[PDB]
């Protein structure tokens, strides 16, 4: 309609709101993205054309809504405050749709909360007129899970392990690396996992685990898998639709909320990895 993304994504960052970010993309036909170029960004993964700022000047990001004549921007950025969103809204007068995920206010025209734990409820008095779309209506799950979710599957494995596509704190190896050697262990990340090397020695050293490096089918391997452990952002969602019995890893603070709705819903959580000796393994 003329949409803008503005959303980074890096090393350090992690994929996870710009492949969220694709999802929602899927329901506009003129869209564009605004991103840092940053070490490790996927910026060369995103189709659609990617503006790379100068700088982290809102009156950058604001100059390019003003000459490209977008019409909605979608923001997917912790960095991108409320003063931030006031004053694009002031300088543009272009539509907002804000994603969050604490519950935090936002000064925008729709509130974007995939989150399943959330509700509209949540954002009284946090958002201005202001559509609040909360909860597990409006997740972002790519197709491949819906077909998926129809499936009965034979179970394969005791355990699948998903950290998501970076695993910057290297979970994935300190959970395998305890797990009994009797049970057998699937692992799924990313090529672009930076202890990649280091998962495939340690698998090497045993019988029981199998690594599998962007893997096409996760939904299935899921569905194959007794027991999922995941971290607790939009894995959930694709966990809950496969109706899946899984463990919840808050991998960061901000996932604090979706790990306290998960554990009164009874699912087991972990919040031990935000601990600073769990920062690297």
């Known amino acids: 309609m003329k ?4 959303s980074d994504s890096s090393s350090q960052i992690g994929f996870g709101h710009i492949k969220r970010d694709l999802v929602l993309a899927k329901q506009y036909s003129d869209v564009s993205f605004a991103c840092l170029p940053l070490e490790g960004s996927l910026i060369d993964e995103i189709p659609y054309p990617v503006y790379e700022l100068s700088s982290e000047s809102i009156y950058e990001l604001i100059n390019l809504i003003k000459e490209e004549k977008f019409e909605l921007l ?3 950025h ?8 006031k004053l694009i809204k002031l300088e543009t ?24 734990y959330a509700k509209a409820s949540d954002y009284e008095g946090l958002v201005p007129k202001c559509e609040v779309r909360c909860g597990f209506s409006y ?3 790519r197709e491949e899970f819906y077909q998926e979710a129809k499936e009965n599957r034979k179970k394969k494995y005791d355990f699948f392990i998903c950290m998501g596509g970076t695993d910057i704190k290297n979970l994935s190896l300190q959970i395998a690396s305890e797990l009994p050697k009797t049970k ?13 090397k280091k998962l495939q020695k340690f698998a090497k050293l045993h019988n029981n685990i199998r690594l599998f490096i962007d893997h096409e089918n996760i939904a299935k391997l899921m569905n194959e898998s007794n027991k999922l452990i995941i ?7 694709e966990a809950l639709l496969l109706k899946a019995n899984f463990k919840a890893i808050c991998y960061v603070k901000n996932q604090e909320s979706t790990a ?8 087991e959580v972990e919040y031990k990895y935000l601990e600073h000796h769990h920062h690297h393994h």
């Open 3 to 6: 949409v803008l993304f503005r």
């Open 74 to 76: 979608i923001i997917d």
């Open 78 to 85: 912790y960095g991108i405050s409320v003063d931030d969103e």
């Open 93 to 116: 007068g272009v539509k907002i749709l804000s994603f969050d995920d604490e519950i935090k206010p936002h000064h925008c025209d729709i509130l974007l909360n995939v989150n399943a």
């Open 139 to 141: 997740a972002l799950i």
């Open 184 to 196: 057998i262990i699937s692992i799924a990340t990313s090529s672009s996992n930076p202890n990649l």
């Open 231 to 237: 971290s607790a952002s939009s894995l959930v969602n």
């Open 260 to 267: 306290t709705w998960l554990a009164k819903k009874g699912y």
